[PDB]
Design an enzyme around this catalytic site. Structure first.
Site, PDB file in Angstrom:
ATOM      1  N   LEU A   1     -70.736 -33.264   4.877  1.00  0.00           N
ATOM      2  CA  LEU A   1     -70.027 -34.447   4.377  1.00  0.00           C
ATOM      3  C   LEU A   1     -68.795 -34.694   5.246  1.00  0.00           C
ATOM      4  CD1 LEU A   1     -69.893 -36.730   2.436  1.00  0.00           C
ATOM      5  CD2 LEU A   1     -69.394 -35.185   0.579  1.00  0.00           C
ATOM      6  N   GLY A   2     -68.688 -35.876   5.841  1.00  0.00           N
ATOM      7  CA  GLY A   2     -67.534 -36.248   6.636  1.00  0.00           C
ATOM      8  C   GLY A   2     -66.943 -37.571   6.170  1.00  0.00           C
ATOM      9  N   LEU A   3     -65.732 -37.859   6.604  1.00  0.00           N
ATOM     10  CA  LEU A   3     -65.100 -39.149   6.310  1.00  0.00           C
ATOM     11  C   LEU A   3     -65.266 -40.102   7.490  1.00  0.00           C
ATOM     12  CD1 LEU A   3     -63.123 -40.803   4.397  1.00  0.00           C
ATOM     13  CD2 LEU A   3     -61.317 -40.030   5.973  1.00  0.00           C
ATOM     14  N   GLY A   4     -65.828 -41.273   7.278  1.00  0.00           N
ATOM     15  CA  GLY A   4     -65.892 -42.328   8.295  1.00  0.00           C
ATOM     16  C   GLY A   4     -64.572 -43.082   8.405  1.00  0.00           C
TER      17      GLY A   4
ATOM     18  N   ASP B   1     -65.121 -38.481  11.142  1.00  0.00           N
ATOM     19  CA  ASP B   1     -65.845 -39.197  12.200  1.00  0.00           C
ATOM     20  C   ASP B   1     -64.957 -40.298  12.771  1.00  0.00           C
ATOM     21  OD1 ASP B   1     -68.567 -39.756  13.543  1.00  0.00           O
ATOM     22  OD2 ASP B   1     -67.941 -41.737  12.817  1.00  0.00           O
TER      23      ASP B   1
ATOM     24  N   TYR C   1     -62.865 -47.771  17.581  1.00  0.00           N
ATOM     25  CA  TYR C   1     -62.323 -48.154  16.275  1.00  0.00           C
ATOM     26  C   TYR C   1     -60.827 -48.507  16.323  1.00  0.00           C
ATOM     27  CZ  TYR C   1     -66.666 -45.825  14.668  1.00  0.00           C
ATOM     28  OH  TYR C   1     -67.937 -45.403  14.458  1.00  0.00           O
TER      29      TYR C   1
ATOM     30  N   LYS D   1     -66.396 -40.372  19.959  1.00  0.00           N
ATOM     31  CA  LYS D   1     -67.516 -41.011  20.654  1.00  0.00           C
ATOM     32  C   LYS D   1     -67.002 -41.703  21.909  1.00  0.00           C
ATOM     33  CE  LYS D   1     -69.351 -42.075  16.055  1.00  0.00           C
ATOM     34  NZ  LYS D   1     -68.159 -42.579  15.326  1.00  0.00           N
TER      35      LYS D   1
ATOM     36  N   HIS E   1     -71.739 -43.068  22.312  1.00  0.00           N
ATOM     37  CA  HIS E   1     -71.710 -43.958  21.139  1.00  0.00           C
ATOM     38  C   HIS E   1     -72.949 -44.843  21.094  1.00  0.00           C
ATOM     39  CE1 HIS E   1     -68.556 -46.069  18.335  1.00  0.00           C
ATOM     40  NE2 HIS E   1     -69.795 -46.194  17.846  1.00  0.00           N
TER      41      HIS E   1
HETATM   42  N1  LIG Z   1     -72.313 -44.366  15.525  1.00  0.00           N
HETATM   43  C1  LIG Z   1     -72.180 -45.658  15.224  1.00  0.00           C
HETATM   44  O1  LIG Z   1     -72.537 -46.596  15.927  1.00  0.00           O
HETATM   45  C2  LIG Z   1     -71.661 -45.968  13.842  1.00  0.00           C
HETATM   46  C3  LIG Z   1     -71.838 -47.225  13.245  1.00  0.00           C
HETATM   47  C4  LIG Z   1     -71.398 -47.612  11.992  1.00  0.00           C
HETATM   48  C5  LIG Z   1     -70.738 -46.645  11.286  1.00  0.00           C
HETATM   49  N2  LIG Z   1     -70.450 -45.365  11.880  1.00  0.00           N
HETATM   50  C6  LIG Z   1     -69.653 -44.357  11.125  1.00  0.00           C
HETATM   51  O2  LIG Z   1     -70.136 -44.256   9.788  1.00  0.00           O
HETATM   52  C7  LIG Z   1     -69.044 -44.495   8.865  1.00  0.00           C
HETATM   53  C8  LIG Z   1     -69.567 -45.075   7.568  1.00  0.00           C
HETATM   54  O3  LIG Z   1     -70.284 -46.326   7.795  1.00  0.00           O
HETATM   55  P1  LIG Z   1     -69.550 -47.718   7.444  1.00  0.00           P
HETATM   56  O4  LIG Z   1     -68.088 -47.668   7.653  1.00  0.00           O
HETATM   57  O5  LIG Z   1     -70.353 -48.719   8.215  1.00  0.00           O
HETATM   58  O6  LIG Z   1     -69.887 -47.968   5.907  1.00  0.00           O
HETATM   59  P2  LIG Z   1     -70.150 -47.193   4.539  1.00  0.00           P
HETATM   60  O7  LIG Z   1     -69.595 -45.826   4.553  1.00  0.00           O
HETATM   61  O8  LIG Z   1     -71.615 -47.339   4.250  1.00  0.00           O
HETATM   62  O9  LIG Z   1     -69.401 -48.141   3.503  1.00  0.00           O
HETATM   63  C9  LIG Z   1     -67.962 -48.324   3.603  1.00  0.00           C
HETATM   64  C10 LIG Z   1     -67.578 -49.315   2.533  1.00  0.00           C
HETATM   65  O10 LIG Z   1     -67.921 -48.783   1.229  1.00  0.00           O
HETATM   66  C11 LIG Z   1     -66.752 -48.837   0.400  1.00  0.00           C
HETATM   67  N3  LIG Z   1     -66.731 -47.733  -0.475  1.00  0.00           N
HETATM   68  C12 LIG Z   1     -66.615 -46.367  -0.127  1.00  0.00           C
HETATM   69  N4  LIG Z   1     -66.762 -45.586  -1.189  1.00  0.00           N
HETATM   70  C13 LIG Z   1     -67.054 -46.393  -2.192  1.00  0.00           C
HETATM   71  C14 LIG Z   1     -67.305 -46.082  -3.551  1.00  0.00           C
HETATM   72  N5  LIG Z   1     -67.263 -44.815  -4.001  1.00  0.00           N
HETATM   73  N6  LIG Z   1     -67.602 -47.135  -4.353  1.00  0.00           N
HETATM   74  C15 LIG Z   1     -67.613 -48.430  -3.933  1.00  0.00           C
HETATM   75  N7  LIG Z   1     -67.414 -48.713  -2.630  1.00  0.00           N
HETATM   76  C16 LIG Z   1     -67.096 -47.708  -1.775  1.00  0.00           C
HETATM   77  C17 LIG Z   1     -65.581 -48.780   1.367  1.00  0.00           C
HETATM   78  O11 LIG Z   1     -64.461 -49.423   0.709  1.00  0.00           O
HETATM   79  P3  LIG Z   1     -62.932 -48.942   0.866  1.00  0.00           P
HETATM   80  O12 LIG Z   1     -62.745 -48.370   2.202  1.00  0.00           O
HETATM   81  O13 LIG Z   1     -62.172 -50.244   0.653  1.00  0.00           O
HETATM   82  O14 LIG Z   1     -62.758 -47.979  -0.246  1.00  0.00           O
HETATM   83  C18 LIG Z   1     -66.109 -49.680   2.495  1.00  0.00           C
HETATM   84  O15 LIG Z   1     -66.012 -51.104   2.238  1.00  0.00           O
HETATM   85  C19 LIG Z   1     -68.123 -45.378   9.684  1.00  0.00           C
HETATM   86  O16 LIG Z   1     -66.873 -45.630   9.099  1.00  0.00           O
HETATM   87  C20 LIG Z   1     -68.164 -44.679  11.040  1.00  0.00           C
HETATM   88  O17 LIG Z   1     -67.294 -43.565  10.934  1.00  0.00           O
HETATM   89  C21 LIG Z   1     -70.883 -45.029  13.154  1.00  0.00           C
HETATM   90  N1  LIG Z   2     -73.116 -53.551  14.442  1.00  0.00           N
HETATM   91  C1  LIG Z   2     -72.806 -53.062  15.660  1.00  0.00           C
HETATM   92  O1  LIG Z   2     -73.764 -53.103  16.456  1.00  0.00           O
HETATM   93  C2  LIG Z   2     -71.394 -52.553  15.750  1.00  0.00           C
HETATM   94  C3  LIG Z   2     -71.312 -51.059  15.867  1.00  0.00           C
HETATM   95  C4  LIG Z   2     -69.943 -50.456  15.677  1.00  0.00           C
HETATM   96  N2  LIG Z   2     -69.583 -49.758  14.465  1.00  0.00           N
HETATM   97  C5  LIG Z   2     -69.392 -48.520  14.650  1.00  0.00           C
HETATM   98  O2  LIG Z   2     -69.001 -47.595  13.899  1.00  0.00           O
HETATM   99  N3  LIG Z   2     -69.678 -48.151  15.995  1.00  0.00           N
HETATM  100  C6  LIG Z   2     -70.042 -49.248  16.661  1.00  0.00           C
HETATM  101  O3  LIG Z   2     -70.429 -49.561  17.764  1.00  0.00           O
HETATM  102  C7  LIG Z   2     -68.845 -51.381  16.213  1.00  0.00           C
HETATM  103  C8  LIG Z   2     -67.531 -50.922  16.268  1.00  0.00           C
HETATM  104  C9  LIG Z   2     -66.618 -51.696  16.924  1.00  0.00           C
HETATM  105  F1  LIG Z   2     -65.322 -51.268  16.951  1.00  0.00           F
HETATM  106  C10 LIG Z   2     -66.966 -52.862  17.534  1.00  0.00           C
HETATM  107  C11 LIG Z   2     -68.276 -53.286  17.517  1.00  0.00           C
HETATM  108  C12 LIG Z   2     -69.243 -52.569  16.811  1.00  0.00           C
HETATM  109  O4  LIG Z   2     -70.523 -53.057  16.758  1.00  0.00           O
END
Ligand SMILES: NC(=O)c1ccc[n+]([C@@H]2O[C@H](COP(=O)([O-])OP(=O)(O)OC[C@H]3O[C@@H](n4cnc5c(N)ncnc54)[C@H](OP(=O)(O)O)[C@@H]3O)[C@@H](O)[C@H]2O)c1
Ligand SMILES: NC(=O)[C@H]1C[C@]2(NC(=O)NC2=O)c2cc(F)ccc2O1
Length: 316
Positions: free
Chosen positions: A16-19, A44, A49, A78, A111
């Site tokens: 479990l990690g924090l995004g 994470d 970001y 990343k 990334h």
């Molecule tokens: N490798 C990549 O390309 C990639 C891409 C996308 C994401 N990521 C990573 O994955 C992480 C998580 O994905 P994500 O940010 O796209 O979205 P997510 O974790 O699926 O959803 C985040 C959203 O859910 C809300 N939320 C969180 N807990 C909640 C709860 N208990 N009840 C109701 N709503 C809740 C948050 O609101 P609040 O913050 O307002 O509480 C925020 O609007 C990212 O932050 C990033 O670290 C990596």
């Molecule tokens: N939907 C996409 O394809 C997203 C991915 C992303 N979200 C994320 O966590 N990693 C990512 O690449 C993101 C983050 C940014 F800061 C800017 C663009 C962007 O495009």
């Protein structure tokens, strides 16, 4: 359930990690401080970001406070697409380390498999509007990542948004020195990824599930998109177990042997989201959640669909 999974570099990663994508810089320091206070040991991050300095302020405070020891944290960042060139990778890692106030990362990911023209713009598009690629090959980017391990800047390297055959290219790279430890990919009940997870696990590659809640704060959401947190069928499963919908959506990938990284900047939700080690979804629950798959993606990187290495053409 066990809190940490063994990686193919011999280190253990918290499941479990924090995004932190979209976490506002004015809110993410408190969010990471609260997360560490209530048990999280994995964060994470990513340079793209634009909040790594503020994440680092929180980590540094909790380390100086002796709330946690560095060895107990698992910090991930990343390499952004405009730094795939061999001569830019170390600098990109070092900027992330400086921002995060760290002398090593536990895991550093490519990334996206897509390299972009270097420069100040994270998404450098031509007069017409298409991403301008870099010609650097992703096997050469991988070799540059391997140098980071041998220099002590990172303990593990991995990949993100790699499709099955891109994984395959890395794994079949002539001269491969370190296999990827992790492939971080989008995964939730509307994008269940059975094919790609299976392939990766079969090879000793751990999968991290991103956007596990369906990213309700994604910048391009439309009212008519599906919504996992509002799906009555998922709320029904949550009600049955006397948990929240979010808690079910976090526990689901944990029981597939995935790592999961829900984002929040809300202190109550950060705490709630961690309280997922005290219940179990049944196999029937798991199969029922898997049945909701619709191949729906939060993150489709729509400006890169013609890049040689765009990942989401391949089935998996
Ligand atoms: N490798 C990549 O390309 C990639 C891409 C996308 C994401 N990521 C990573 O994955 C992480 C998580 O994905 P994500 O940010 O796209 O979205 P997510 O974790 O699926 O959803 C985040 C959203 O859910 C809300 N939320 C969180 N807990 C909640 C709860 N208990 N009840 C109701 N709503 C809740 C948050 O609101 P609040 O913050 O307002 O509480 C925020 O609007 C990212 O932050 C990033 O670290 C990596
Ligand atoms: N939907 C996409 O394809 C997203 C991915 C992303 N979200 C994320 O966590 N990693 C990512 O690449 C993101 C983050 C940014 F800061 C800017 C663009 C962007 O495009």
């Amino acid at each position: 359930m066990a809190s940490r999974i063994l990686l193919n570099n011999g280190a253990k990663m918290p499941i479990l990690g924090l995004g932190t994508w979209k976490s506002p810089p004015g809110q993410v320091t408190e969010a990471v401080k609260v997360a560490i206070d209530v048990g999280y040991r994995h964060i994470d991050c990513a340079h793209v970001y634009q909040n790594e300095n503020e994440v680092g302020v929180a980590i540094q405070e909790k380390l100086r406070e002796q709330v946690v020891k560095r060895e107990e944290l698992f910090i991930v960042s990343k390499l952004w697409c405009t730094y795939h060139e061999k001569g830019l990778v170390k600098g990109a890692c070092q900027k992330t380390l400086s921002d995060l106030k760290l002398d090593y990362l536990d895991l550093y990911l490519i990334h996206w498999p897509t390299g972009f023209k270097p420069g100040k713009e994270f998404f450098p598009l031509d007069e017409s509007g298409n991403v301008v690629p870099s010609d650097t090959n992703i096997l050469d980017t991988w070799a540059a990542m391997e140098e980071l391990v041998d220099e002590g800047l990172v303990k593990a390297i991995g990949i993100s948004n790699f499709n099955h055959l891109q994984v395959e290219m890395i794994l079949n790279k002539p001269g491969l020195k370190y296999k990827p430890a992790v492939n971080q990919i989008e995964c939730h009940p509307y994008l269940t990824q059975e094919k790609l997870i299976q392939y990766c696990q079969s090879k000793g590659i751990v999968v991290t599930a991103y956007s596990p809640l369906g990213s309700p704060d994604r910048p391009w959401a439309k009212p008519e998109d599906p919504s996992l947190l509002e799906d009555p069928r998922i709320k029904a499963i949550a009600a049955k177990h006397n948990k929240t919908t979010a808690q079910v959506l976090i526990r689901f990938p944990m029981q597939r042997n995935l790592v999961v990284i829900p984002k929040s900047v809300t202190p109550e939700r950060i705490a709630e989201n961690f309280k997922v080690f005290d219940f179990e979804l049944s196999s029937q629950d798991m199969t029922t959640l898997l049945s909701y798959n619709r191949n729906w993606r939060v993150c489709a990187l729509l400006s890169c669909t013609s890049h040689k290495d765009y990942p989401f053409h391949e089935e998996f």
